[PDB]
Design a protein around this ligand. Sequence first.
Ligand SMILES: *[C@@H]1O[C@H](CO)[C@@H](O[C@@H]2O[C@H](CO)[C@@H](O)[C@H](O)[C@H]2NC(C)=O)[C@H](O)[C@H]1NC(C)=O
Ligand SMILES: *[C@@H]1O[C@H](CO)[C@@H](O)[C@H](O)[C@H]1NC(C)=O
Ligand SMILES: *[C@@H]1O[C@H](CO)[C@@H](O)[C@H](O)[C@H]1NC(C)=O
Lengths: 92, 72
Amino acid sequence: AYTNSFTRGVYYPDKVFRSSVLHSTQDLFLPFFSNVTWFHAIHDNPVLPFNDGVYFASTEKSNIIRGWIFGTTLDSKTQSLLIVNNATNVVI
Amino acid sequence: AWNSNNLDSKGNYNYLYRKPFERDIYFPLQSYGFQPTNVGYQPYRVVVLSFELLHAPATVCGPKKSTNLVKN
Ligand SMILES: *[C@@H]1O[C@H](CO)[C@@H](O[C@@H]2O[C@H](CO)[C@@H](O)[C@H](O)[C@H]2NC(C)=O)[C@H](O)[C@H]1NC(C)=O
Ligand SMILES: *[C@@H]1O[C@H](CO)[C@@H](O)[C@H](O)[C@H]1NC(C)=O
Ligand SMILES: *[C@@H]1O[C@H](CO)[C@@H](O)[C@H](O)[C@H]1NC(C)=O
């Protein structure tokens, strides 16, 4: 399944304050109006590629989505990042 | 970097060798065997200190000491 990303995934490129200015920068961004892939809890979390990087989102209220997993092979034969967001905290 | 023939020679065979800051685990595997008898042949210890001069908060600083702040 797919939908339009519109403007999403703009982020502060560097930790510098600037104001009233049109700063120009070369970096990894989610391209404007690009298709996102969309997924559901009805019997859907296979190993995606990560490419140059991932924008992610969820629309929520249940808070059933509680983390992310990353690497090359994800099978102990390399170190694998686990992120959790349980109860109140990001935990890594 | 500094000579370590006094520590890292016996011989010492543990020193296997093979993008910026790449790490990796026919193949290019080769190793030393350092003996104190080895002079450019001797083991040298190295530390490369790389300094992250990004715009983020500072966290390693030199032995300097602050003044009071002065304004206007
Ligand atoms: C980072 O990971 C990629 C794969 O996730 C590595 O590139 C692949 O390396 C295997 C053998 O290790 C090859 O069979 C593939 O053909 C390679 N793929 C590509 C796209 O080149 C890459 O070497 C890894 N780099 C580091 C520093 O770990
Ligand atoms: C985006 O998704 C639509 C269907 O929702 C498809 O027709 C279109 O080709 C897709 N475009 C890209 C760039 O993935
Ligand atoms: C989240 O999980 C960690 C262990 O993974 C635990 O220490 C912690 O109490 C949990 N709750 C919060 C609010 O972090």
